[PDB]
């Protein structure tokens, strides 16, 4: 059973809690509570890899800076969760991945974008401006909801997959 760390990064208003407790209870709460910092671990068998997958809900809020670089240092995945009710974090993202560059030293790292909230009415994100963005770095794009679970492991296995093909 290998140790796979994989810290989850997004803005407010996303609702980060609804994909965590989606996979680790199957339950959607609809509910925002201010999460500073939640650990949570699921054991999944990521195409037969029966593995242990530690996770981290961290703050939203700009207000944690030094201890940013804390766990960005010990995270192996980055999950990028936003959603694509606001065109304003799609922009926040680069901000996060320019900053994440400084705390992995390297170009080469497995990561991959994810919108939330796909499943609302209030969509004013295409996929294209996202599929059009995300060719450039060339990293695969997935859309899943948490709340009518579509994909959600799908999602988590093709991380697994870019952080082994990383290692190995
Ligand atoms: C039970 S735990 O070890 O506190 C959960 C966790 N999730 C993580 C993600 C990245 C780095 C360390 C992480 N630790």
Redesign the pocket.
Known sequence: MTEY???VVGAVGVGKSALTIQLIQNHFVDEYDPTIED???KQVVIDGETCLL???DTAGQEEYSAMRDQ?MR????FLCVFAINNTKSFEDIHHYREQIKRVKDSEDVPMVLVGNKSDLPSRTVDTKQAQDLARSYGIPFIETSAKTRQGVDDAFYTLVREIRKHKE
């Open positions: 760390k994989l810290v650990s949570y671990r530690d996770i981290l766990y010990t995270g192996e995945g």
